[PDB]
Design a protein around this nucleic acid. Structure first.
Lengths: 91, 98, 105, 97, 516, 82, 97, 104, 94
DNA sequence: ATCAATATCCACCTGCAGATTCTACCAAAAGTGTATTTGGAAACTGCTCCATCAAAAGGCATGTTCAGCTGAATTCAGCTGAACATGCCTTTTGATGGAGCAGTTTCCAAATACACTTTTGGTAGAATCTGCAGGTGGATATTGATG
DNA sequence: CATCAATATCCACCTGCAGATTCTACCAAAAGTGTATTTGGAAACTGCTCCATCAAAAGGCATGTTCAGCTGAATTCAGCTGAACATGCCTTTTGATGGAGCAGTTTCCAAATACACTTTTGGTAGAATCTGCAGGTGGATATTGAT
């Protein structure tokens, strides 16, 4: 194998913390937020996770019906449409 | 005495910069790892399309921007300029998902 | 001789809309003028959204319509904003707005 | 082999619509996809509303009147009125065509 | 042994100063340290650049080709032990490129041709039990005593090997010199091989080569083609252009037999002849580059005389054609091809032939018509551009008032009030007899023949070209023997030197076959 | 009879009682007017669809069926009327 | 004269109107308002009693939900008195405006 | 002479829901087990809501189920409330729920 | 008089299976009928949509099971799926 | 700490609109045995594209400091809460001409269902064109800081 | 409150690049017209249910007034925790590359219609009996404010 270059990158389990501080700050700024409390970040991470539990569950349930285990962008388009959050550009 | 802008000028400057721009703010790989682990939480050995990850990213940032706008309005309503957990909790409760 | 769209003075295909209504299982029977009316409505909506996008682009000193121009066109019109209040535009962003309290002095 | 993938889109139609409106304006691939998705979504919504109205009134046929009613129901006021007027003119002149 | 060292430190220090590319090769490969216990299982020669330095300092290399072989063996080992996606593979590729760039002037400074490790393309074998099939490349194959080969459907190993180039030892200085680079043949110079440096030291010159295309037997068609090409080159007056010699090396009378389906349908009725006699001719164009004859174009045609039964009377057909993009200059190669084909069309029309047929069938990928092992950088023309090139050929021909007019095969058949397949010309190896037999078979499972012929002609009307000229050696018996000889003798045309070596090899073979 | 100006018929103690159902203790002066206005807006939203349903059905009277269908299509599904 | 503290009666009314389910708004003024709105939209219309009851119940439900949102917003602002600003905040967050 | 409703053993009519599926023109073909599955799901949901309403009436010392009991049953169940989040129960009212801050 | 279908007797039978000694008000039965009707409508509509996306023109058990999983959350969804599976296997076993 | 005035929960009796228990119908359902059709069960496969590894850099995690953001304590004009007098606007009972809703008949323009010639659009490869992202040289407020 | 000055940013501009635009030719997929068949809702008439209107006795919140205690708003000041910055660093993206799945293809057997018979049965007209909480009566019991 060789290579002589590797890294543990022990962030796989806690990928919820993988959403960086500047990323959350930029998302808050795009919403017009001027000042951010210190406890906002983990709560927004949890909200993002909850949104994932809402959307990807429907996407996966759609995926298995087509005798497939590869999620398609059309499936998540339908998942967002059925929740009142229809997304354009991926039709 | 090094130059130092007070909080509020450069803050609104970057707010305007990010509001006039449309590029993605969440990095591709960490969000992809999060969405993959959440997917395998329901069914192991799943596969993802790049366009699917793009759609997830767009939906997540759009929803988060909407939620942050709601929290900003809640904070301004309470004679405050900083969003705090009670603001977002109230916004989520009155939105209807909670 | 003449296509249904050309006969009705429309650009969108009438027969294609008729076929989509047929295979979409909306009703057992579908009329002849229903696809024409639907194509006319879609044509009006498309013309309005594209002219608004072109106005936004020429305001932004751009000659090609981009999703940002589409967001500017859709959201700046409160009527279309009510029409698409539950739809998010990809790569569209948000309108530049600053709260009065957050403004300096 | 006959392995040529085929997919439906309104790209040429919206392109000709643009040249009917703005001859010197183009469309990007992302913008084209957004427009196609918007057209598909509005078509699905209006057609489903028309089907719902026909089913509620025990009507097995889809005509222009129920589509106009659906447009009045869901499309916004000025937009609905203008779309109704244009559709009425189009169907009227198609009838005499 | 100090001279070889003084020559070899520069290239090796140039390799060393490429950091961090050369870093992994500075120390011996340690399986336990690097966590690769399978290194010794695959690699049979564990040694490194430090060992090369130690051998060079102690004078272990009697001559630099041993060092070249060692460094190329290390490159091959690094390439085989690691996948091309790995860092070590791309570092080894970079070091190999640097060595190739650096060694050539240094290696030439000692009097050698170059310091490159050259290996031939894999040699596709041939089957023996079926006597018609061949051994596929990059696939499992059977061998027995290294002489008998069998395929899957006719020792189990996979055919992925590279054949290194041969070497010739100098008679005077004793150096080992490549056969190809200086183009040395034992038959041409039985006295022995003398390097260029030794010849220049004693003010001597290489013996004149009489195994050349210019000394081949002369033919009227070949002489006409060669003088027309020479006149065209003189008119162009290109500084890079040289002298072109065209010789007809094959001319025999053969007969083509009617296929069984057509024989039963029409020949048995007394309407068509059993066979059509014809004369086949093969000619090649040779050009002098750097004082060396080089083959760059060739042709295979079938000529049907007046004695042939109709409808093949006064008809010529181009069975196959090939070319190599080594003609100088590059721009005038296409024009020279124009002149050669126009010269041929003028010669056949002067003889008395009235109709010409061209099949615009580009070679498939990995397939060669005449010249085996086409260069990798030579793009295979597409059917559309080939048809455009043929149209330009026809336009240039009519511009000289040699060809009256040109039409497609469908248009020619329409103008010729064709009503049955009997009126079409019958050529050996042509696609039309095969498709006619296929149509006959299809009718067997099911004016029908005429309808199928019309449909097929309209489907492939742009492929076949019909030219109206008049209006109002067992080694070259077919293209299979030459290709087989080239494959067996590794006569490749993938490079200028290899093409020149193959040209001399075929010239020597023809000269030896001439004398019996 | 074209009767007009009965918005005062939305009784102020009635609004207070409705807010009592909403768990509110104290009500400002303008809350009554604001609730009347938002109620008027909701009435505009619902009666428009109800009258459109009535018109499409060749009827001159408004039935509970069209009302509940309009409310349910407006995201305000109502039970008790089929 | 016996007098209760300001607030005790408010709690009593909150408990009473959260325990009960009978409709709180008067029938006749609401029916007259519905008639006036219908006349403003399209003249010569008739209303079934069941339609009026459904409209009334839906209106009470929507206003009760709005009151929940307004009360929660008022408590969020360290206040017990509801003001219109809470109402427009709730309506803007709900997306109705 | 065995009806499919008795064969399935379910209270909800399989043939009736099959006819309703046919009439709505959801698709040009309807499977055989589709009405069975719809009837089973609807009966399960009805049984759950009815038992919850009966329990709520039992805490109210009432032997007759009223729409107030329906509201008590639906709004006290988290997932059932989520299912009927945008649905209003007629004559149901609201649950008794007041914040601790409002209490004195 | 036009026939007006209602699920009254089936709801009453379910009650007698669950609560034999409990009464029902007329308003509550209408709410039950409306709930059954709109739940059935939602399930059938989303199942038809799902068949539409996958280019399926037949409504089978898989689509409606997926619809139940999507609409009903958690325990009710799993219980409905289990009862539907046993019902369909009993139907195909007879 | 005790006490008097109120609203709350509750036991108990009674008239009654509504929930529940009998009898017969019948047509809209509901059930069942062939002829027919067809979305789909099932296996081998060419073709996409999805998982995985190495370097560049466009960024991300950490320590410092501080005047503003937020939070705690005090007081007040008033107004909405609580109480009460007066009453009037809505309830319910009962009846009624009739505008309007819906049951039944007929059938003709509209839609269905192929067959067919007509035309029409999405894709693959060619090669010219063009709107747009950076960046270097100005250069333009602007805000923090100096005065 | 007027201006020395570093810096993010807009236009004046431009030159290079991936994508949008232009063109010719191919071919399978729509698509209008013609012919024959089917039908269902508009007109035409008519029975009838419940919408709107009228009328009067009556009451319980509707309307208005009066007294006042808390309460958001205003003010002031203090602990402080995020914002902006400089620093060290580090995780990401794209390009390239093996095979894991996704549809295209071909067979064809289990499964869903059409419709002709044959049969259970759900509102529902019709009337007599059981049933459970609306309403009223009375006294036990927490609740609360300030005696």
């Amino acid at each position: 194998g060789k290579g002589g270059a590797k890294r543990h990158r022990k962030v796989l389990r806690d990928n919820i913390q993988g959403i960086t501080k500047p990323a959350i700050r930029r998302l808050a700024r795009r919403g017009g937020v001027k000042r951010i409390s210190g406890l906002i970040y983990e709560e927004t991470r949890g909200v993002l996770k909850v949104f994932l539990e809402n959307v990807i569950r429907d996407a996966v349930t759609y995926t298995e019906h087509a005798k497939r285990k590869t999620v398609t962008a059309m499936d998540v388009v339908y998942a967002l449409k059925r929740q009142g959050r229809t997304l354009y550009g991926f039709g | 005495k090094p130059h130092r802008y007070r909080p509020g000028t450069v803050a609104l400057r970057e707010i305007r910069r990010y509001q006039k721009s449309t590029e993605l703010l969440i990095r591709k790989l960490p969000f992809q790892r999060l969405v993959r682990e959440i997917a395998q939480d329901f069914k192991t050995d799943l596969r993802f399309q790049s366009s699917a990850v793009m759609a997830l990213q767009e939906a997540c940032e759009a929803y988060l921007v909407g939620l942050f706008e709601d929290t900003n309005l809640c904070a301004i309503h309470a004679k405050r300029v900083t969003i705090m957990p009670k603001d977002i909790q109230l916004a989520r409760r009155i939105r209807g998902e909670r | 001789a003449k296509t249904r769209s050309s006969r009705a003075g429309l650009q969108f295909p009438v027969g294609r809309v008729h076929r989509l209504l047929r295979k979409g299982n909306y009703s057992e029977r579908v009329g002849a003028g229903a696809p024409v009316y639907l194509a006319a409505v879609l044509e009006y909506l498309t013309a309005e959204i594209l002219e608004l996008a072109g106005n936004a682009a020429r305001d932004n000193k751009k000659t090609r319509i981009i999703p940002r121009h589409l967001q500017l066109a859709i959201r700046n019109d409160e009527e279309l904003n009510k029409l698409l209040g539950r739809v998010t535009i990809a790569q569209g962003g948000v309108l530049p707005n600053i709260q009065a309290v957050l403004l300096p002095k | 082999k006959r392995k040529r993938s085929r997919k439906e889109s309104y790209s040429i139609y919206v392109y000709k619509v643009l040249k009917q409106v703005h001859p010197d304006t183009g469309i990007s691939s992302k913008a084209m996809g957004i427009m196609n998705s918007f057209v598909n979504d509005i078509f699905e919504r209006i057609a489903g509303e028309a089907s719902r109205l026909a089913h509620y009134n025990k009507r097995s046929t889809i005509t222009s009147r129920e589509i106009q009613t659906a447009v009045r129901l869901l499309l916004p006021g000025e937009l609905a009125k203008h779309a109704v007027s244009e559709g009425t003119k189009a169907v009227t002149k198609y009838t005499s065509a | 042994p100090e001279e070889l060292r003084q020559a070899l430190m520069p290239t090796l220090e140039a390799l060393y100063r490429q950091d961090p590319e050369s870093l992994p090769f500075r120390q011996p490969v340690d399986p336990q340290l690097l966590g690769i216990p399978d290194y010794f299982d695959i690699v049979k020669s564990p040694m490194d650049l430090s060992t090369i330095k130690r051998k060079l300092d102690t004078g272990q290399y009697q001559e630099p080709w041993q060092y070249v072989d060692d460094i190329w063996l290390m490159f091959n080992n690094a390439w085989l032990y690691n996948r091309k996606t790995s860092r070590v593979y791309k570092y080894c590729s970079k070091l190999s490129e640097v060595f190739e760039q650096e060694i050539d002037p240094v290696m030439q400074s000692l009097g050698y041709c170059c310091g490159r490790k050259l290996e031939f393309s894999p040699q596709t074998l041939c089957c023996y039990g079926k006597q018609l099939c061949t051994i596929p490349r990059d696939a499992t194959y059977y061998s027995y005593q290294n002489r008998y080969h069998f395929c899957e459907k006719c020792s189990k190993r996979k055919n992925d090997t590279l054949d290194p180039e041969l070497f010739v030892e100098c008679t005077e200085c004793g150096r080992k010199m490549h056969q190809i680079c200086v183009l040395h043949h034992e038959i041409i110079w039985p006295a022995g091989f003398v390097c260029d440096g030794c010849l220049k030291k004693s003010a001597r010159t290489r013996k004149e080569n009489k195994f050349s295309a210019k000394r081949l037997p002369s033919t009227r068609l070949g002489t006409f083609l060669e003088n027309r090409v020479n006149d065209f080159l003189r008119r162009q007056n290109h500084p890079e252009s040289g002298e072109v010699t065209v010789r007809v090396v094959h001319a025999s009378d053969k007969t083509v037999e009617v296929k069984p389906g057509m024989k039963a349908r029409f020949v048995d009725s007394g309407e068509m002849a059993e066979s059509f006699p014809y004369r086949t001719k093969a000619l090649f164009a040779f050009e002098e580059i750097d004082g060396v004859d080089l083959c760059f174009f060739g042709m295979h045609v079938q000529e049907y005389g007046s004695d042939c039964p109709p409808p093949n009377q006064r008809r010529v057909y181009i069975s196959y054609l090939d070319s190599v993009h080594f003609f100088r200059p590059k721009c005038l190669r296409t024009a020279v091809y124009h002149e050669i084909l126009i010269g041929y069309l003028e010669y056949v029309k002067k003889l008395g032939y009235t109709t010409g047929h061209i099949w615009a069938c580009p070679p498939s990928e990995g397939d060669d018509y005449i010249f085996h092992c086409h260069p990798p950088d030579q793009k295979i023309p597409k059917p559309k551009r080939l048809q455009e090139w043929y149209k330009k050929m026809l336009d240039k021909a009519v511009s000289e008032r040699i060809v009256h007019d040109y039409k497609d095969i469908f248009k020619q058949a329409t103008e010729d009030r064709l009503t049955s397949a009997k009126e079409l010309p019958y050529f050996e190896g042509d696609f039309w007899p095969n498709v006619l037999e296929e149509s006959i078979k299809e009718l067997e499972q099911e004016n029908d023949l005429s309808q199928k012929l019309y449909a097929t002609m309209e489907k492939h009307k742009e492929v076949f070209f019909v030219i109206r000229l008049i209006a109002g050696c067992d080694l070259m018996d077919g293209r299979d023997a030459f290709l087989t000889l080239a494959r067996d003798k590794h006569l490749e045309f993938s490079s200028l030197r290899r093409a020149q070596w193959s040209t001399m090899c075929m010239l020597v073979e023809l000269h030896t076959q001439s004398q019996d």
